[PDB]
Curated annotation (Swiss-Prot):
It comes from the Bacteria. Changing N133S: In strain: NA-1383/97. Changing E203D: In strain: NA-1383/97. The keyword Transcription does not apply. Changing E50Q: In strain: NA-1383/97. It comes from Streptococcus pneumoniae serotype 4 (strain ATCC BAA-334 / TIGR4). Mn(2+) binds at H36, H108, E174, N249. One of its GO terms (biological process) is metal ion transport. It is a lipid-anchor. This is Manganese ABC transporter substrate-binding lipoprotein PsaA. GO terms for cellular component: plasma membrane. Disruption phenotype: Reduces growth. Severe reduction in intracellular Mn(2+) accumulation without affecting intracellular Zn(2+) accumulation. Severe reduction in survival rates in oxidative stress conditions and in presence of human polymorphonuclear leukocytes (PMNs).
Length: 278
C-alpha cells in the first residue's frame, strides 16, 4: 500500500475520507496537540523517511518558528511537489495585518469549508498521481466528500445571513478565524493576534473589552485548546457570556463529538450560529 504521512489530524482525517483503507497513513501531530512549534519524535522521522507521499498544511503552520516540518523533510531527503505537498495550494490566502508578503500568510485556512474542499482536491490529486490503480476510487470519494462539505457550507451561510448584523461578530482568544470571517460574512475580534509571544496580557484584555462594550454581540467563544482564563476575564468584564468551546487546531478524539474534519466544522458552525442568534 502507498505510505502516506499527514502533519496533523485535520489533514489526516480529510485524507482518510478520500483514501479509506487503500493506504498506510501516519499522522505526526496527535489529536489535541499544537500543530505549530511541535517536536517530532523518532517514529515521525522514520515514517517520513519511508513515506511515498507527505501532506502538510503549508502557509506557515509547520514551517514558522522552529520550522519542524522543514527540518523533517530535509533530513528525509524529500522534495517539494515531488514527495511532499501543501494541501492549501489554491486557497485565497489571507495575510497578517493585510500585508501581502512571503511569510505573512495566515495558516488557518481550513476554518472555512471551501478551503477544506481545496485540501481534499489536492489530496485526491496527489493520491491519484502516486497510486493510479485506485484513481477512480479516490475521485468517487472526493466527489462524495466535497458534496458533504459543500452542503454544510451552503446551510451555514444561509443561517449566518439571517442573523441580525449588529450581533454578528466571532470573538475568540486568538485571531485564528479570519478565513471563517471571510467565508461566512462574520467579522472577527480577538484578544491576541497570530504569532503573539505573550498571550492574554492585561493590555490585550482591556483592548478587547473596550471594543466589545461598543457592540451588541450576544455571545463569546473560546477555543478548546487555549487557556480560557483571558476569555473568562473578557466575558466577566463585558458581561457577555461564553456560549461554547470551539475547535480550532485539531479534530476531537474518536467517538467524541467533532471527531472528524466534517463533524468538527459542523459543531463549530452549529455553536456559532446558535450563540450569535441569542
Ligand atoms: Mn493559531
Amino acid at each position: 500500500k502507498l505510505k502516506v504521512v499527514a502533519t496533523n489530524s485535520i489533514i489526516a482525517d480529510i485524507t482518510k475520507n478520500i483514501a479509506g483503507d487503500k493506504i498506510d497513513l501516519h499522522s505526526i501531530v496527535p489529536i489535541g496537540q499544537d500543530p505549530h512549534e511541535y517536536e517530532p519524535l523518532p517514529e515521525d522521522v522514520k515514517k517520513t523517511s519511508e513515506a511515498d507521499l507527505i501532506f502538510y498544511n503549508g502557509i506557515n503552520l509547520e514551517t514558522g518558528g522552529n520550522a519542524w516540518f522543514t527540518k523533517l523533510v530535509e533530513n528525509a531527503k524529500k522534495t517539494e511537489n515531488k514527495d511532499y505537498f501543501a494541501v492549501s495550494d489554491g486557497v485565497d490566502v489571507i495575510y497578517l495585518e493585510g500585508q501581502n508578503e512571503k511569510g505573512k500568510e495566515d495558516p488557518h485556512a481550513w476554518l472555512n469549508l471551501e478551503n477544506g474542499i481545496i485540501f481534499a482536491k489536492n489530496i485526491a490529486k496527489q493520491l491519484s498521481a502516486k497510486d493510479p490503480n485506485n484513481k477512480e476510487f479516490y475521485e468517487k470519494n472526493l466527489k462524495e466528500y466535497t458534496d458533504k462539505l459543500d452542503k454544510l457550507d451552503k446551510e451555514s451561510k444561509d443561517k449566518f445571513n439571517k442573523i441580525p448584523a449588529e450581533k454578528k461578530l466571532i470573538v475568540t482568544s486568538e485571531g485564528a478565524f479570519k478565513y471563517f470571517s471571510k467565508a461566512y460574512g462574520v467579522p472577527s475580534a480577538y484578544i491576541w493576534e497570530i504569532n503573539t509571544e505573550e498571550e492574554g496580557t492585561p493590555e490585550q484584555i482591556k483592548t478587547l473589552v473596550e471594543k466589545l462594550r461598543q457592540t451588541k454581540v450576544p455571545s463569546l467563544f473560546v477555543e478548546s485548546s487555549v487557556d480560557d482564563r483571558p476569555m473568562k476575564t473578557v466575558s466577566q468584564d463585558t458581561n457577555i457570556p461564553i456560549y461554547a468551546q470551539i475547535f480550532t487546531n485539531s479534530i476531537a478524539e474518536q467517538g467524541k463529538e467533532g471527531d472528524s474534519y466534517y463533524s468538527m466544522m459542523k459543531y463549530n458552525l452549529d455553536k456559532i450560529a446558535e450563540g450569535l442568534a441569542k
